[PDB]
Design an enzyme around this catalytic site. Structure first.
Site, PDB file in Angstrom:
ATOM      1  N   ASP A 269       0.767  -1.239   0.000  1.00  0.00           N
ATOM      2  CA  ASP A 269       0.000   0.000   0.000  1.00  0.00           C
ATOM      3  C   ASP A 269       0.804   1.299   0.000  1.00  0.00           C
ATOM      4  O   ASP A 269       0.544   2.187  -0.815  1.00  0.00           O
ATOM      5  CB  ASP A 269      -0.977  -0.006   1.179  1.00  0.00           C
ATOM      6  CG  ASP A 269      -1.934  -1.183   1.130  1.00  0.00           C
ATOM      7  OD1 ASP A 269      -1.945  -1.903   0.107  1.00  0.00           O
ATOM      8  OD2 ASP A 269      -2.679  -1.384   2.108  1.00  0.00           O
TER       9      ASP A 269
ATOM     10  N   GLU B  66      -9.253  -2.427   2.460  1.00  0.00           N
ATOM     11  CA  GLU B  66      -8.963  -2.060   3.840  1.00  0.00           C
ATOM     12  C   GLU B  66     -10.180  -1.400   4.474  1.00  0.00           C
ATOM     13  O   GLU B  66     -10.501  -1.639   5.642  1.00  0.00           O
ATOM     14  CB  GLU B  66      -7.780  -1.089   3.894  1.00  0.00           C
ATOM     15  CG  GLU B  66      -7.367  -0.702   5.304  1.00  0.00           C
ATOM     16  CD  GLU B  66      -6.249   0.320   5.322  1.00  0.00           C
ATOM     17  OE1 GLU B  66      -6.528   1.513   5.057  1.00  0.00           O
ATOM     18  OE2 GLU B  66      -5.091  -0.073   5.590  1.00  0.00           O
TER      19      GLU B  66
END
Ligand SMILES: Nc1ncnc2c1ncn2[C@@H]1O[C@H](COP(=O)(O)CP(=O)(O)OP(=O)(O)O)[C@@H](O)[C@H]1O
Ligand SMILES: [Mg+2]
Ligand SMILES: [Mg+2]
Ligand SMILES: [Mg+2]
EC number: 6.3.1.5
Lengths: 271, 247
Positions: free
Chosen positions: B50, B158
């Site tokens: 990420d 997420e």
């Protein structure tokens, strides 16, 4: 007009029924904690108007929950950065709030460690302002630590008179789980305190974030260049001078990012 | 269906064009930073997928602004608590600036203070959130000092499970990865030329399937839809009586 739009967005009411406002807000606190299954609330008590009001509402909320047969507790916490100039007023606030539990966490050592580390890593000394924001954000961490350890929700003190100017620390005092004061102007907050029987001193002192080492207790009005009476007049829909409208509308536009979740390409409020 | 609602709310596309996603997301960063007039971005680089993706997009964004004659910079910052992958991420991202801030002494001061004030030791889970929130303070300190916007690495995979610390890594100014599932992010890193080592109670691939509109077992959807509902507070500003999402 923009004034009417800002008023709607911030949920402000030109005139209020003090007793009804208190019931609505206490009821919200009860409903939220009940829904989430949390054990209660935690909130930093600064000695200032906002936390005094939010604190009393929280204590009333948990006493109401217990009275009806439920379980709930409120932990009021002092968060001084070393010696707080107006600790006496914070004690007076605690005396009025009468919280189930009165805790304390001095954030100085934490802020000092961070500040010393920053200079060691970058060679730069944090400006008084940026260090101040570290203080506000450390208070957030402290409350959330107590919250996570004790299973409590973190109360926030944001209200309309603060939201309109965006005068608060993003992820600092601005970081919280729920807000019982949303929509209230500064004077309306005072009116609720009066209805709740707070000692006059708690609502007659100048609002201040008191985050600076070199300029402690710096008043909001000095920093903003606008008084709360002007801010409240604008929010309550009263006819204000054009200078007030221009100043507040400018600040509102510039600080929208503080009233929204992080920006993404799918949002349009920032364009 | 609840799956369609969530898919829509998180801005997930069932299928993506990797190159255009990079273009759209780089253009978003450029457009936002110009609008606010900030000097650039700052992002903690952990070595993970990420932050590696968000970082590379950030660097491409600032180089594009400078190419068009503007001023912009990107500060990549390591935020260790007291490494090879992070180093590798930096070699790939190639940020204008590479900073470091060890959060150890801060978390320790807080932890020791907590214990002396309450008589209680900070549990591992709560101490972990302190570490995450301290990293937030670190990035915002840099941003405040240097006039930079804090980047966040949140994405659909997420966001759906809400597994991130509120006001920790969840605290940022803008999010270039919004809408992407975990594997789509991987796809973007691959297209960006990142080394495999960087882009490679429920699995992520299962979650990505749900988000991209594929068929999943009830246990999955049931769990994910419940996880979503209970973590909605992490995807909204603080709750007030004027909100209904928490009801
Ligand atoms: N020294 C301190 N001790 C404890 N909590 C503090 C604190 N300084 C700030 N806080 C927390 O941060 C919140 C925001 O502070 P302020 O913006 O100054 C509103 P207030 O201080 O509560 O009333 P005020 O407007 O009279 O200043 C407080 O309500 C409190 O919860
Ligand atoms: Mg405030
Ligand atoms: Mg104050
Ligand atoms: Mg104990």
């Amino acid at each position: 007009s923009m004034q009417e739009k800002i008023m709607r967005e911030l949920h402000v009411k030109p005139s209020i029924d003090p007793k009804q406002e208190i019931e609505d807000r206490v009821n919200f606190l009860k409903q939220y904690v009940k829904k989430t299954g949390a054990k209660g609330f935690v909130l930093g008590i600064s000695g200032g108007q906002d936390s005094t009001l939010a604190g009393r509402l929280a204590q009333l909320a948990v006493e109401s929950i217990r009275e009806e047969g439920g379980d709930a507790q409120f932990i009021a916490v002092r968060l001084p950065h070393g010696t707080q100039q107006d600790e006496d007023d914070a004690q007076l606030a605690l005396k009025f709030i009468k919280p189930d539990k009165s805790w304390k966490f001095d954030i100085k050592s934490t802020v000092s460690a961070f500040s010393d580390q920053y200079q060691q890593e970058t060679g730069d000394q944090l400006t008084d302002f940026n260090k101040g924001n570290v203080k506000a954000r450390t208070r957030m961490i402290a409350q959330y630590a107590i919250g996570g350890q004790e299973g409590l929700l973190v109360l926030g003190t944001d209200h309309a008179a603060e939201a309109v100017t965006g005068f608060f620390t993003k992820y600092g005092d601005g970081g919280a789980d729920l807000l019982p004061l949303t929509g209230l102007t500064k004077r309306q907050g005072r009116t609720l305190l009066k209805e709740l029987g707070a000692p006059e001193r708690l609502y007659l002192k100048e609002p201040t974030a008191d985050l600076l080492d070199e300029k402690p207790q710096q008043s909001d009005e000095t920093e903003l260049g606008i008084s709360y009476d002007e801010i409240d007049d604008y929010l309550e829909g009263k006819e204000v001078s054009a200078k007030v409208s221009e100043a507040l509308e400018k600040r509102y536009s510039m600080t929208e990012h503080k009233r929204q979740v992080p920006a993404s390409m799918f949002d349009d409020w920032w364009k």
